[PDB]
Design a protein around this ligand. Sequence first.
Ligand SMILES: O=P(O)(O)C(Nc1ncnc2sc(-c3ccc(C4CC4)cc3)cc12)P(=O)(O)O
Ligand SMILES: O=P(O)(O)C(Nc1ncnc2sc(-c3ccc(C4CC4)cc3)cc12)P(=O)(O)O
Ligand SMILES: O=P(O)(O)C(Nc1ncnc2sc(-c3ccc(C4CC4)cc3)cc12)P(=O)(O)O
Ligand SMILES: O=P(O)(O)C(Nc1ncnc2sc(-c3ccc(C4CC4)cc3)cc12)P(=O)(O)O
Ligand SMILES: O=P(O)(O)C(Nc1ncnc2sc(-c3ccc(C4CC4)cc3)cc12)P(=O)(O)O
Ligand SMILES: O=P(O)(O)C(Nc1ncnc2sc(-c3ccc(C4CC4)cc3)cc12)P(=O)(O)O
Lengths: 337, 337
Amino acid sequence: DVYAQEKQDFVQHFSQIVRVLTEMGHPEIGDAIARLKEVLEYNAIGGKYNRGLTVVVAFRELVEPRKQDADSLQRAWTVGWCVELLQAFFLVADDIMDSSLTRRGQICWYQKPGVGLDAINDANLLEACIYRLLKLYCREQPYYLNLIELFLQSSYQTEIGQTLDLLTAPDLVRFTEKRYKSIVKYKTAFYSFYLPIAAAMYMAGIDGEKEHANAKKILLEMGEFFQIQDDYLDLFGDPSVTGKIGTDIQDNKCSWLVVQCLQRATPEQYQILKENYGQKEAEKVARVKALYEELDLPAVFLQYEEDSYSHIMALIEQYAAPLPPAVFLGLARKIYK
Amino acid sequence: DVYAQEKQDFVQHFSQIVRVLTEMGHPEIGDAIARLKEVLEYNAIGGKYNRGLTVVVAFRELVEPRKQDADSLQRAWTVGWCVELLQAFFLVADDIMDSSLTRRGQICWYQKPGVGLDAINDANLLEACIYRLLKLYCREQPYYLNLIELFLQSSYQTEIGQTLDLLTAPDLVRFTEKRYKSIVKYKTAFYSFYLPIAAAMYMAGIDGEKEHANAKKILLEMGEFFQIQDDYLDLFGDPSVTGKIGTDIQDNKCSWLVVQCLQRATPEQYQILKENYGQKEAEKVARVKALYEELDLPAVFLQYEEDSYSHIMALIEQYAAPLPPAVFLGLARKIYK
Ligand SMILES: O=P(O)(O)C(Nc1ncnc2sc(-c3ccc(C4CC4)cc3)cc12)P(=O)(O)O
Ligand SMILES: O=P(O)(O)C(Nc1ncnc2sc(-c3ccc(C4CC4)cc3)cc12)P(=O)(O)O
Ligand SMILES: O=P(O)(O)C(Nc1ncnc2sc(-c3ccc(C4CC4)cc3)cc12)P(=O)(O)O
Ligand SMILES: O=P(O)(O)C(Nc1ncnc2sc(-c3ccc(C4CC4)cc3)cc12)P(=O)(O)O
Ligand SMILES: O=P(O)(O)C(Nc1ncnc2sc(-c3ccc(C4CC4)cc3)cc12)P(=O)(O)O
Ligand SMILES: O=P(O)(O)C(Nc1ncnc2sc(-c3ccc(C4CC4)cc3)cc12)P(=O)(O)O
């Protein structure tokens, strides 16, 4: 596995990431820097690192091996960790706003004794660390500004996505397909799928607008597919297999499932849905599920997967050049659950 | 007044700022953009605009009038508003973290019905808008990257400052002068005093490290002075004159007053302080005040002002060149209350 190959080195680099972000020529910010260390250690560690690793895998596939000096790699690892820091920023903040209890098999940072709403500042520090790292490791590089702009834009797009999600889910009237597709695109797909390849692209000197537009077209369609899958597996997944015990229905999400359900429902079924969506009790969660089954949404999903395979293989056929197909295909394999 | 002269045009530009940040080639983010308009309108408007205006005043004092085309000015106004957007980001967030009720004579944004902790995202959008504006108005300019780095660094320094404030005020043991001075420097002085002049400097082609270090030396010392004044006036100000009804003691702040009080107190006075600092009731707030009076902290302040005048005039004498002294002196006059 091309990701398993890169992994150990990527994770070991985290140690260096931290050292450099904390190491006291100015003594009396010491205490704040110590808090910064704790924030990084708790929140940047424990994921699958798919997004950060994608930077490293893509880098290796896109830069001729004659230009993979010890130093270029340090940079690749660093930029990968920059993506992981972006993720951490979003998730610390998202947990506060959703009033979540747990994340990545542990108490959400803001819920830890004596953190609370101070986590808002902590989240912002994580974001800040992106640009500090980019400066320290890539200031002299020709792609420096490209990377700054890409990260800032990725942040902007994600935040806009979050705004749309927040407005959409404060009433099922609002849960349309055009709306669902739009949330997924801004809120997850840009920073999860486009950003990591795009970074690698810029680090490899592939900076053209067309090349970027082409990679983007593939990657946003991949990101939509993987989010829709995520929505399906939330309910009909086997949690021992996926790792997620679904709570989308209780949590009242604009999920792909509900959108499809809404499109198909008779007026009376709308009512059963209006009646049971977003409740604690299993009794009710089971009536929503049983409705999705009644409307045969798994078959609808299966069909969506089949269609979606053809479309995405075709997209890569057409739009991958002059990147290696394996960049796209390697990422698909890694994310698919 | 050089600020009153620039003001009407600066504030009128806000309209343009908004238009450009909202104007629907992508239709289905419409609703999110509408929310963005509301966030800007509520949170970026109603201050004195000292920091944003400083960019515009400094620009005019630093660029020869032959290079003050309609376009250079648009840019100056825009960059000024970028400082105002940074301020707004910090304050929306700070209000959430402090659990404040009011700001700028109105309900804090997060306290408005149906905003709540969604304000966290809103705060981040305000930050994002800085870099969108910088791109739209200054991408082709030679100082573009300088401005990106300055804003990102200003954010980093402020956040670090906030971390230090949060750690320092979660116990009077912690309220030392080295610590107080350090909070003020990172949390307020860099972005309130250095950032706006520095931006103008870069827009004028003054990009040298020495020149920046020199401006910085003056401006951080100015920022310390104005924060210490702010602390004094919180208690001994006349609120009808200043506009602030002080609540530093109740709110348990690391204020200059308490630091000085701590340095002077006998063991028994420490106890009266330990006993009354951070309470609701006036009875107790009056015993803290009466102690500061007992220890004659106003005289200590007066002396601090006198010393501080000589020092800062001397700093400008020595370090202002090749900037016009009036940049520094104009800002002092404007902020002094
Ligand atoms: O209550 P305030 O606003 O008068 C005052 N707060 C501030 N005054 C001046 N500048 C700043 S910058 C600042 C801050 C707050 C939150 C953040 C979070 C985004 C990370 C960053 C900076 C708070 C603050 P304080 O009495 O808590 O010291
Ligand atoms: O994962 P499987 O083999 O158990 C099964 N998967 C599929 N079954 C039938 N047709 C298809 S097409 C498909 C697929 C996989 C990857 C992609 C990636 C390019 C995005 C697109 C479609 C998975 C799949 P399901 O239990 O998720 O329904
Ligand atoms: O297990 P199978 O083959 O009988 C069948 N699976 C499939 N049938 C038809 N086409 C496909 S494509 C497919 C697949 C799964 C994972 C991937 C990962 C590289 C992304 C790609 C394609 C599974 C599958 P299903 O009855 O479990 O849905
Ligand atoms: O609960 P989760 O984390 O599984 C999920 N949230 C997310 N999943 C994937 N990507 C993202 S990016 C995102 C977000 C949250 C807060 C912000 C605030 C800083 C502005 C920005 C982005 C939330 C999120 P959802 O079930 O609320 O959709
Ligand atoms: O403002 P005033 O005239 O009523 C009086 N101000 C002063 N009185 C005596 N000495 C001084 S030195 C001083 C000053 C003003 C501006 C500065 C700016 C360069 C930072 C530094 C020191 C104000 C002042 P106070 O009521 O604040 O004590
Ligand atoms: O009103 P005053 O002159 O009798 C006396 N004020 C001063 N005495 C001696 N030196 C100075 S310098 C000073 C001042 C006030 C505002 C400024 C603003 C430009 C920043 C500068 C200097 C007021 C002052 P105070 O008894 O009110 O403290």
